[PDB]
Design a protein around this ligand. Structure first.
Ligand SMILES: O=C(CS)Nc1cccc(Cl)c1
Ligand SMILES: O=C(CS)Nc1cccc(Cl)c1
Ligand SMILES: [Cl-]
Ligand SMILES: [Zn+2]
Ligand SMILES: [Zn+2]
Ligand SMILES: [Zn+2]
Ligand SMILES: [Zn+2]
Lengths: 229, 228
């Protein structure tokens, strides 16, 4: 089940994959959750997304030390919002190499985020350029197009049932997408469907703001987005 | 100004011309879109197609008559019809084409033909040189999301000119025309980033207004401020 560790929650999703969850109180609504991933790749660990804060992200590293006890080789962060990049300092303090879409790194200062140390770029078909994502092990990074934000990226976990949609995808029980002025409401639906088509064998869809769901999360999200066009 | 068919050309500098093409639309009437033609030694470089293949062919035929140098390459500045509607005409003329990778990704969704090559950008917005080989005086800058997620901009080295494409409107414009693909959170910062990337440019060229001073940048950013 869910393992509590400090103020975070960790859930094993597969033999080599865990979901990290961190919480932030907002005005009028407490304990807004955000999820990321932790992946064991042989003798190293890879992280997808920080927690909301530096202190919480340090607790992710502490949990990894206690439960996995392998070095964290790198982290990928999936766009320039606080839930995904708010804890970059904890990673850099620990010497962990960080990667984000070049556009996320360009947006980070405007958003009050610390940029990742390396930039990912993408082919016209959305797949990460290998020269920018060397030695990513099972992390298969895909840029699906603009949607939740212009910079949002997604990550398949090779060999598992799992694909991570980040904040682009919401579960099949969602009532809305959030989506604000930095959403692209013209392309959101196609971007959500492109994520599904990029990871056609994924049966467990992991998301930032919902618990894991089946592929219906992708379809339901796309159908909500269709109505915004 | 000179005419070739349905196209209008205006020389802006010794080696730079603006091309203007028109598409009839309900209510608006004829809608102008501007791009650039740059003479770089023994070759010509193009920024943006016209709205259609046939209008883009008219650009190329005017170049052959007026300049009579081969067109080496074209850069197109986002995946909307005014900027990429004529890709097939460029390709049929043997012209190598370049666009933001994201523009090429969006082009099929938009009913556009993708460029042959994709540009990618550093975290500071400047094009990665390995993706923009032999661009001569064209200095390509991604200012951030604004008019669209993929909009790019181009400065012309050796001149006072910077091209804002559809991101920038002139200092008399009343609104930005933003649709669902605009990023209204970042638009203002992206407009200002374009200005800061080309801080010495005194002639700002843009898609839907005649050339203006840097007041186009300031006014665009201030209009965008109000959408946040
Ligand atoms: O702050 C962000 C960045 S995606 N998201 C957010 C905020 C409040 C509630 C929820 Cl469900 C998501
Ligand atoms: O169609 C496009 C793509 S940016 N722009 C357009 C359309 C109508 C009027 C104006 Cl002034 C610009
Ligand atoms: Cl596993
Ligand atoms: Zn977000
Ligand atoms: Zn989020
Ligand atoms: Zn446009
Ligand atoms: Zn336009």
């Amino acid at each position: 089940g869910d393992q509590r560790f400090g103020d975070l929650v960790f859930r094993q999703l597969a033999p080599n994959v865990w979901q990290h969850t961190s919480y932030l109180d907002m005005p009028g609504f407490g304990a807004v959750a955000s999820n990321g991933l932790i992946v064991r790749d042989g003798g190293r660990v890879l992280v997808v997304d920080t927690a909301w804060t530096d202190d919480q992200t340090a607790q992710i590293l502490n949990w990894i030390k206690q439960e996995i006890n392998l070095p964290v080789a790198l982290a990928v962060v999936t766009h320039a919002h606080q839930d995904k990049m708010g804890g970059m300092d904890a990673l850099h303090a620990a010497g962990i190499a960080t990667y984000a879409n070049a556009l996320s790194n360009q947006l980070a200062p405007q958003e009050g985020m610390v940029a990742a140390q390396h930039s990912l770029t993408f082919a016209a078909n959305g797949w990460v350029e290998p020269a920018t994502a060397p030695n990513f092990g099972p992390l298969k990074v895909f840029y699906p197009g603009p949607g939740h934000t212009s910079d949002n990226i997604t990550v398949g976990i090779d060999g598992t049932d799992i694909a991570f949609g980040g904040c682009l995808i919401k579960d099949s029980k969602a009532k809305s997408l959030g989506n604000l002025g930095d959403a692209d409401t013209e392309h959101y639906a196609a971007s959500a469907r492109a994520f599904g088509a990029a990871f056609p064998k994924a049966s467990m869809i992991v998301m930032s703001h919902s618990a894991p769901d089946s592929r219906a999360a992708i379809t339901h999200t796309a159908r909500m987005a269709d109505k915004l066009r």
